[PDB]
Amino acid sequence: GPEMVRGQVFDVGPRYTNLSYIGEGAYGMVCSAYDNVNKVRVAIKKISPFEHQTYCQRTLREIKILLRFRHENIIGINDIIRAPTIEQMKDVYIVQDLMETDLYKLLKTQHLSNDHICYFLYQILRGLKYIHSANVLHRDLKPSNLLLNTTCDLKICDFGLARVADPDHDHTGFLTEYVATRWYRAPEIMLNSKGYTKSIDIWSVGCILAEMLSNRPIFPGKHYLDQLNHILGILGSPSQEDLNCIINLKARNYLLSLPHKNKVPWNRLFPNADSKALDLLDKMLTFNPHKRIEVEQALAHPYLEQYYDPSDEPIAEAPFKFDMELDDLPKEKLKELIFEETARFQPGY
Ligand SMILES: Nc1ncnc2c1ncn2[C@@H]1O[C@H](COP(=O)(O)OP(=O)(O)NP(=O)(O)O)[C@@H](O)[C@H]1O
Numbered sequence: 001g002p003e004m005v006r007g008q009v010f011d012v013g014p015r016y017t018n019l020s021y022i023g024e025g026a027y028g029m030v031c032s033a034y035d036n037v038n039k040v041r042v043a044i045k046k047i048s049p050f051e052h053q054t055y056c057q058r059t060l061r062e063i064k065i066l067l068r069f070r071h072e073n074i075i076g077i078n079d080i081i082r083a084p085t086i087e088q089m090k091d092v093y094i095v096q097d098l099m100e101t102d103l104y105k106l107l108k109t110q111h112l113s114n115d116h117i118c119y120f121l122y123q124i125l126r127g128l129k130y131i132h133s134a135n136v137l138h139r140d141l142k143p144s145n146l147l148l149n150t151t152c153d154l155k156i157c158d159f160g161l162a163r164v165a166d167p168d169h170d171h172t173g174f175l176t177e178y179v180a181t182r183w184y185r186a187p188e189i190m191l192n193s194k195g196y197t198k199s200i201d202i203w204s205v206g207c208i209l210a211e212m213l214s215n216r217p218i219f220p221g222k223h224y225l226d227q228l229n230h231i232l233g234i235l236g237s238p239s240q241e242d243l244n245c246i247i248n249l250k251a252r253n254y255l256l257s258l259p260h261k262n263k264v265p266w267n268r269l270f271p272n273a274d275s276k277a278l279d280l281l282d283k284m285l286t287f288n289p290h291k292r293i294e295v296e297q298a299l300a301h302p303y304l305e306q307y308y309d310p311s312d313e314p315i316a317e318a319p320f321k322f323d324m325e326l327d328d329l330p331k332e333k334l335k336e337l338i339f340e341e342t343a344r345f346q347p348g349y
């Protein structure tokens with residue numbers, strides 16, 4: 001029999017055994033396991049995306065991007081399992097290195113030292129520099145998508161929302177709405193919902209940094225439209241300069257309609273925090289996408305000066321172009337392309 005975990009079958013045997021629940025999502029489960037061939041612990045991410053076109057499109061991106069990345073702060077695909085024939089393929093199992101925990105879990109039991117906070121943030125942006133260098137948006141950075149080891153090694157995971165945006169095309173109007181986990185959404189996801197850029201990742205990192213500072217989501221929006229309130233609750237009302245830059249009239253007017261809100265100094269929310277950390281937190285959580293700090297300048301910031309070394313922060317040698325964005329296709333065609341992507345992992349080939 002294939003091992004079961006909480007009544008979800010995990011058809012990965014006989015190579016991978018002793019499964020333990022580690023996490024789940026809308027359309028998949030993750031287990032700790034033992035690689036009987038390499039005599040190592042692993043993590044296996046069961047993905048069951050074939051019923052919907054969105055899940056298929058995201059699954060194909062997550063595999064294609066992760067397969068072409070190699071970076072110390074980005075989880076690798078060791079192995080992919082699926083059925084030997086497409087009709088029989090109903091799930092896809094993505095075997096990765098087992099990390100010990102994630103930031104979400106770590107933050108429930110630990111107040112992190114300034115040194116840890118600093119070093120984790122350093123690693124997040126080291127990764128994010130590779131990701132952005134490659135013309136990828138991650139689009140779901142949050143504590144639970146950051147893995148950790150007792151050595152304090154960090155890895156970005158869950159490229160389930162990630163995507164290529166070739167900088168040689170204007171993606172305004174073509175990007176998916178409603179991306180990221182709600183508390184980590186940049187304001188322009190709400191106001192320029194198809195017109196955002198990779199700066200939405202730098203916003204997510206601000207929220208993660210805040211969360212590392214206070215063990216608490218800074219912007220805990222109770223629902224989609226409450227999220228924009230919690231943001232302005234701290235940042236104050238946008239400047240007149242910041243409103244004019246919102247091209248969407250519908251969204252500009254809604255903001256103009258809202259009551260005036262005052263800025264909460266970072267000092268007041270993080271009274272025991274490093275001032276340098278609050279400075280970077282300020283540049284990462286800037287309302288204007290265009291004035292918000294970029295990944296390179298973030299690393300260069302004084303807070304991360306013990307770790308910054310552009311000689312030891314790799315970038316992608318072949319950044320991804322429009323060709324890797326041709327996924328606006330029926331679920332049956334995307335399943336075929338997922339079959340083709342995962343074939344190099346099969347007895348055969
Ligand atoms: N390689 C790994 N090592 C250790 N834990 C892992 C690993 N991969 C995933 N996890 C854990 O599994 C959880 C869910 O995995 P993830 O890849 O984020 O799933 P998801 O199905 O996309 N869910 P969601 O982030 O809500 O979209 C993570 O938040 C971690 O707690």
Ligand SMILES: [Mg+2]
Nearest residue numbers: 025158160161
């Ligand atoms: Mg996901």
